[PDB]
Amino acid sequence: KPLVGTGMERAVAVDSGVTAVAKRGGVVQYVDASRIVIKVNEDEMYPGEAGIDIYNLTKYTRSNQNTCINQMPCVSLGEPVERGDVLADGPSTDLGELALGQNMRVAFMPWNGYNFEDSILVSERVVQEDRFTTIHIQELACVSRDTKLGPEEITADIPNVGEAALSKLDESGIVYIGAEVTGGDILVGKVTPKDSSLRVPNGVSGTVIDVQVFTRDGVEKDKRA
Amino acid sequence: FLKPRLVDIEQVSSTHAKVTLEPLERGFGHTLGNALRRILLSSMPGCAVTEVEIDGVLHEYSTKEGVQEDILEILLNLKGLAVRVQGKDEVILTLNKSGIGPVTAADITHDGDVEIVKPQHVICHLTDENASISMRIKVQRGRGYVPASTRIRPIGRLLVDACYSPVERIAYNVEAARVEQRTDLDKLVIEMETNGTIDPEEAIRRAATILAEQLEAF
Amino acid sequence: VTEFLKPRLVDIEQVSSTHAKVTLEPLERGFGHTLGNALRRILLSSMPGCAVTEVEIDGVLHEYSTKEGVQEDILEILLNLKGLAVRVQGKDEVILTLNKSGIGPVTAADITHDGDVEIVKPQHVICHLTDENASISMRIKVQRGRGYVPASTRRLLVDACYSPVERIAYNVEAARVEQRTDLDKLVIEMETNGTIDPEEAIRRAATILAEQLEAFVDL
Amino acid sequence: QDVVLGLYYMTRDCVNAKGEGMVLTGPKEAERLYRSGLASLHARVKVRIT
Amino acid sequence: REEAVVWDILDEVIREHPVLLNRAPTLHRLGIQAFEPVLIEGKAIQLHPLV
Amino acid sequence: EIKELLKLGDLPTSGQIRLYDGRTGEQFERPVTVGYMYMLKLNHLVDDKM
Amino acid sequence: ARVTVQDAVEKIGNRFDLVLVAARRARQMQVGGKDPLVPEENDKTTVIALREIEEGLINNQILDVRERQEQQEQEAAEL
């Protein structure tokens, strides 16, 4: 949260759509890391089709600018909520309050020229506490076209490449979810009729958290799919 | 040239204490205080969680049905842990908890030479009647700050950055001492603030040992 | 866990005497500043040595005065006396005499020898006399002390340069071991007044600091 | 914009000092005097220079 | 593959081999200057404050 | 109002406090400003430009 | 072992002929097996060529006369 604000953070947070705002007031019956259940009070229930309402939070997913949007709950179990209040903060929000950064303990002074023109001199406690370490989910696609001489296969065997580089892949050529893949490894093993497998770009680490396979109709399947 | 001596230790709180060095020659107070502060903040040994292996979690960007936090937040909480293992340099802890209620640090089935200094440190919240977690917490010694992307295998291990630094705030103070007939004798009061996993006298002694070892070069 | 990179004096290459420039590497990350600052603060303000404290000129009783036949003023004489580097044995404080008469410069070799008391730079001039009838004689007072004692703290008062050092200024720059990224490379530049060697003064200060840190060392 | 400010703060005098009327015997001794905390950087002294 | 000795060879090809640092709007001829490189760990080209 | 809120705690009303150097361990010979400014982090990351 | 080349420019005063002379000398020292006349200090060929220029025992005339006496010796070496 910003220590010094303007009071407009409430409106920006609530009226943006990134946070799950309650529709009818009630009591949190069951709060989960990916789901919130609200037991609405009897005065707010309709006669027909009353029941309760379920809020499915949006977990780690890719934004347009390859950032991370991830709603997380802010209410506790059995906590009475009212209509039109924040139930789970989205990306860069704190209790329904737009929080784009961190409150850094600054000091205005020249320091040995390491802040010469407009530079900043950041203490190592800032990087130790991971106050500014952000997530960047990015998608990498490996399309399989059918050019001349035949179509292309997604087998896990790659010529002129040993098994050390093929250790991460499964039997179907697709990397396991959760691999600690670094720059230069193999994600999808794609072979071109005589190798054009999808490789992680240079100098970028990562952790695979989603694999989605879209197969055109006519091809039965691959076992991973 | 009189020599300093540890004459007083004020354990004013459970974490932060106040050692006293006395006597010091005029000018030596600031020198010793600053050298000890730099060494204590930089090079003190400690223990922190390195790897966590939750049973049903493959990567630190997922969630487990039953807990109130993403696995990333649980890893951050475990990164903010304190422990004072005595003989071993690498110990694998464990944690099994079921039912509704916060999962504090007291739920870790600690061995003999594992002393969790803050049992009430909340790790995660369980919001289900029958939903159990099983994390294989790994703790090892070290020094300084070693991040995950710089150290040195299965897809069940979650690497956690470690901060092997028991100290959190060191503030010294130089003032006139109580000597019978003399002046220009300083009294150093090093007010340190650790997380409880180190003894202040041990920390001062180790800092002095490191400084003397460094000056052994000449 | 307790293993630390031990520095070694890679080169103690020296400019013309009493200007040695010590450089040791590789220090642990941040220890270069600690060692340099501690050594500088010890050498600058706490070092055993002997220096001229007060001088009673025979004919001068006021700081703002001039003696006939002396081309300089009293302040320049006091400045010259302060730069008079001397070495004294177990005797704590003694008094030298500076009888001189005639035209010619008055160097430090024209002082009373007093036996054990030795001048390290006898060529150091003090006064120039332009008249044959002009004579100068004083009883300088040399005392053994620790550090710098200005005359403003305390029969003419001279600032006491007890410390054998003259200019100490460390400089820590980055240096790499074969695999680690960032270490320190302490580069110490030291000048003395000739009464002691620079490399000797460095180890003297190191010993002074080490003996302070022996009551609470783990051994 | 930063070296200029440093050299402007260093090379400037105010009419008072930690030690003002004292007379120095060289730039090296002036640096030794300042770094020892015995005289402020903005004193008004008479140093002997070559 | 970035073995352990390629860094020890890079320090020999770069010892006294100047590089040209050029900013985007090269208004006058001082916008392109040559510096002797110094290898650092990081991803930012350090530049002397005077220039 | 800012100065009164500062005086509500135990902070100086002028805003500036005394800072000591981290390496030399000696005081900066001027009171400097110390406070909590809200720093962002724009996504002009160096690794996306190298 | 080299920062600025102002003295070497003083030796051969064009600041453009210096570049060509140093290029010829450094190419002789690199491709050809010719040896430096000053003790090299693990420096590149260009720095050694500039330093030999600043030591005074090299210029365009000296390079030409050395190459020409080597050429006449080579021609006589055919026998």
UniProtKB/Swiss-Prot annotation, chain B:
Q: Which reaction does it catalyse?
A: RNA(n) + a ribonucleoside 5'-triphosphate = RNA(n+1) + diphosphate
UniProt keyword annotation of Transcription regulation present: no
GO annotation (BP), single: DNA-templated transcription
Q: What class of enzyme is it?
A: transferase
Q: What is its EC number?
A: 2.7.7.6
State the GO CC annotations.
cytoplasm; DNA-directed RNA polymerase complex
Taxonomic superkingdom: Bacteria
Keyword annotations for this protein, in alphabetical order, are: DNA-directed RNA polymerase, Nucleotidyltransferase, Transcription, Transferase
Presence of the UniProt keyword Phosphoprotein in the record: no
Region Alpha N-terminal domain (alpha-NTD): list its residue ranges: 1-218
Family, as annotated: Belongs to the RNA polymerase alpha chain family.
**What's the stated role of this polypeptide?**
DNA-dependent RNA polymerase catalyzes the transcription of DNA into RNA using the four ribonucleoside triphosphates as substrates.
Quaternary structure annotation from Swiss-Prot or TrEMBL: Homodimer. The RNAP catalytic core consists of 2 alpha, 1 beta, 1 beta' and 1 omega subunit. When a sigma factor is associated with the core the holoenzyme is formed, which can initiate transcription.
Domain comment quoted from the record: The N-terminal domain is essential for RNAP assembly and basal transcription, whereas the C-terminal domain is involved in interaction with transcriptional regulators and with upstream promoter elements.
**Name of the protein described by the UniProt record:** DNA-directed RNA polymerase subunit alpha
Which species is listed as the source?
Answer: Escherichia coli O157:H7
State which stretch of the full-length protein is shown: 8 to 231 of 329
Curated annotation (Swiss-Prot), chain F:
N6-acetyllysine (modified residue): where? K7
Q: What does this protein do?
A: DNA-dependent RNA polymerase catalyzes the transcription of DNA into RNA using the four ribonucleoside triphosphates as substrates.
Subunit and interaction comment? The RNAP catalytic core consists of 2 alpha, 1 beta, 1 beta' and 1 omega subunit. When a sigma factor is associated with the core the holoenzyme is formed, which can initiate transcription.
Q: Which family does it belong to?
A: Belongs to the RNA polymerase beta chain family.
Protein name per the record: DNA-directed RNA polymerase subunit beta
* Species of origin: Escherichia coli O157:H7
Shown residues in whole-protein numbering: 1194 to 1243 of 1342
UniProtKB/Swiss-Prot annotation, chain G:
Q: Which pairs of positions does the record mark as disulfide bonds?
A: none
Keyword tags: DNA-directed RNA polymerase, Nucleotidyltransferase, Transcription, Transferase
Protein family membership? Belongs to the RNA polymerase subunit omega family.
Q: Name one GO cellular component term.
A: DNA-directed RNA polymerase complex
Query: What do we know about how this protein assembles, alone or with others?
Result: The RNAP catalytic core consists of 2 alpha, 1 beta, 1 beta' and 1 omega subunit. When a sigma factor is associated with the core the holoenzyme is formed, which can initiate transcription.
User: GO terms for molecular function, please?
Assistant: DNA binding; DNA-directed RNA polymerase activity
* Gene3D superfamilies to which the protein is assigned, alphabetical: 3.90.940.10
Catalytic activity reported: RNA(n) + a ribonucleoside 5'-triphosphate = RNA(n+1) + diphosphate
Function field: Promotes RNA polymerase assembly. Latches the N- and C-terminal regions of the beta' subunit thereby facilitating its interaction with the beta and alpha subunits.
Q: Which Pfam families match?
A: RNA_pol_Rpb6
User: What PANTHER family is this protein classified in?
Assistant: DNA-DIRECTED RNA POLYMERASE SUBUNIT OMEGA
Write out the GO biological process terms. DNA-templated transcription
The record's InterPro entries line, in alphabetical order, gives: DNA-dir_RNA_pol_omega, Pol_omega/Rpo6/RPB6, RPB6/omega-like_sf
The membrane-spanning stretches of this chain are none
User: This chain belongs to which protein, by name?
Assistant: DNA-directed RNA polymerase subunit omega
Q: Which SUPFAM superfamilies match?
A: RPB6/omega subunit-like (SSF63562)
- EC nos: 2.7.7.6
